Amino acid sequence: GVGHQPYRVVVLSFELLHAPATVCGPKKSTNLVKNKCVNFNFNGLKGTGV
């Protein structure tokens, strides 16, 4: 039966750490803007500041 038939199970254990990340999603890198109030996104860390 369906509950007794075998299932292939894939477990992905993600590592959410403050270390420099090696795996990332598809996203491009823009120019770095300094000394101005801008929005920023560093490796998934979003914010707004100078």
Next chain:
Amino acid sequence: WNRKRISNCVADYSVLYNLAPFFTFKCYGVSPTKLNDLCFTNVYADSFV
């Protein structure tokens, strides 16, 4: 309406969990992994099609 009355048991739910025909084990009010750790005064079973 066959209400099977269950009392004076040692209800080992591992045999029911590893039973061949029955699969789904939905529960309300209690947790299935805790079901071998509790004591109930009386259990009532209703088996229909």
